[PDB]
Design a protein around this motif. Structure first.
Motif: not given
Lengths: 122, 49, 49, 195
Positions: A32-33, A36-37, A40-41, A93, A95, C5, C8-11
RNA sequence: CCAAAAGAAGUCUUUCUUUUGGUAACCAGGAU
DNA sequence: GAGGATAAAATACTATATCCTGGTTAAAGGGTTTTCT
DNA sequence: AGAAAACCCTTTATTTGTTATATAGTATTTTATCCTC
């Protein structure tokens, strides 16, 4: 043959499948992370798919027949992408990721046969 | 008991990952970690953290 | 480290300053200092001097 | 245990005693036993000789064929350049078009030359590594080992990890090594004798 | 090796039998 | 100009008296299970 | 049948990376440079 069908399907889709090692229980969380990244990235043109193979085995624990969903490969994720300087960091990177699993030192890509053998519903 | 438990856990995982069939990368990773567990059991801290 | 950290993993637009902060490491550091250290010692109370 | 595992007392402790028994520097022994490089545990050195002459012929054939294909590609590029020149001189188009097309053509020609050189270098590395292959040789660069085992899977066996060291010890006679060391002691002198 | 319970004998309180129950490592501070 | 042999430096491991007492002994996160509504 | 509060397991990951008050002694690997052919 489902094996042949999935071979044909995965032949065309871009990227090469790599293996990532996580903290045992951090597999769905890592997926999931990472998904999402990837947005986002803005590395969504390099990372295309994250898979955590699982299969359901019926167990009679305490005399109770239950089909519990186990993980085929515990502690590993399958990621399809093109390895670069940015994709490597965006994955390494996340988590909960312990790092890439490679042959000698650098990341190594699985063969289509192996990935088909585990992305096929067991 | 902690050091023995780590060895047993790693050995069981590697043993289960061989019969199940897996690529060479994953099996070698498990073997490397098993190798590191026995090193910690015999002499903890002589190589690495 | 945790905050950036987790940024970047939350909308976005669901983030509030309360969902980025994790206070546990801060309070853990204080406990470690005041309980385990060679400078934090039991007061010497043999006599007032 | 599901896999062989070495004892750290005979690997780490200075002087390394496995690295004296097998004559391997500790720096690269740590590579072998922690799955950071391959090691050649065995090689056939006469079957090599024969199939080595044969495979030298075969490798020359392969290199010449690839080079000829690349030369045909370069000839096609040259025909494209001639067509470009035809376009240039035929109608009216001054320095701009001429320079543009010539830069494109020379860039493509040089890229084809570079591709040829790089592929020839890769095949040359494959051949060079195979011809001088010896036991206890560390094959870093996984792809090199994969190509070697695919092309000439015979004539040699290579492993990784502690099982490779186990196979090295199995194929290790202790008398020839001792006699060689005694001779070097009697004659060598210098660091060779002190080692 | 000890405790508790029950039975027997004597003494006015011991003996015999049966059952149950039964440590380390770190860091710190002192002394000669 | 190339190879070898010898100084150099750089890391790797080992040791540093005896005796006593006092305070502590995991957290943190994920996935899951069970009970309550 | 779904939600909330209490179990069971893992692990201190080890990057193309979060760690700088000893000295004294010896021993073993680099390594750099100089000397030779």
């Amino acid at each position: 043959d489902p094996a042949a069908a999935l071979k044909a399907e995965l032949r065309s889709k871009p990227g090469d499948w790599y293996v990532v090692h996580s903290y045992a229980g951090y597999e769905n969380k890592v997926k999931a992370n990472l998904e999402t990244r990837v947005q986002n990235l803005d590395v969504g043109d390099y990372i295309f798919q994250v898979e955590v193979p699982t299969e359901e085995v019926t167990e009679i624990k305490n005399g109770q027949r239950k089909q519990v969903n186990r993980k085929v490969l515990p502690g590993y994720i399958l990621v399809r992408m093109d390895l670069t300087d940015d994709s490597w960091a965006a994955v390494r990177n996340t988590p909960g990721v312990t790092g890439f699993v490679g042959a000698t030192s650098r990341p190594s890509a699985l063969a289509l046969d192996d990935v088909v053998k585990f992305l096929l519903p067991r | 008991n902690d050091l023995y438990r780590r060895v047993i856990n790693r050995n069981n995982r590697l043993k289960r990952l061989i019969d199940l069939g897996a690529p060479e990368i994953i099996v070698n990773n498990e073997k490397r970690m098993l190798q590191e567990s026995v090193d910690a059991l015999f002499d903890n801290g002589r190589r690495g953290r | 480290r945790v905050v950036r950290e987790r940024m970047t993993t939350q909308d976005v637009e669901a983030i509030t300053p309360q969902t980025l902060i994790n206070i546990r490491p801060v309070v853990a550091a204080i406990k470690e200092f005041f309980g385990t250290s060679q400078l934090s010692q039991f007061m010497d109370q043999n006599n007032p001097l | 245990l599901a896999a062989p595992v070495t004892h750290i007392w005979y690997f780490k402790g200075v002087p390394s005693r496995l690295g004296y028994l097998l004559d391997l520097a500790p720096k690269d022994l740590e590579k072998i036993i922690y799955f950071a490089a391959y090691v050649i545990t065995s090689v056939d050195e006469e079957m090599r000789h024969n199939e080595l002459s044969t495979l030298e012929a075969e490798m020359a054939v392969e290199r010449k064929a690839v080079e000829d294909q690349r030369d045909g590609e370069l000839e096609a590029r040259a025909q494209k350049l001639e067509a470009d020149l035809a376009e240039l001189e035929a109608e009216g188009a001054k320095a701009d078009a001429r320079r543009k097309v010539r830069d494109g053509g020379e860039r493509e020609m040089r890229q084809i030359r570079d591709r040829a050189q790089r592929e020839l270098d890769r095949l040359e590395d494959i051949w060079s590594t195979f011809t001088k292959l010896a036991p206890k040789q560390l094959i870093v660069d996984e792809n090199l080992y994969r190509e070697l085992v695919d092309r000439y899977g015979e004539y040699f066996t290579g492993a990784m990890g502690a099982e490779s060291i186990q196979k090295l010890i199995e194929n290790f006679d202790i008398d020839a090594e001792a006699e060689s060391l005694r001779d070097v002691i009697r004659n060598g002198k210098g660091q060779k004798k002190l080692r």
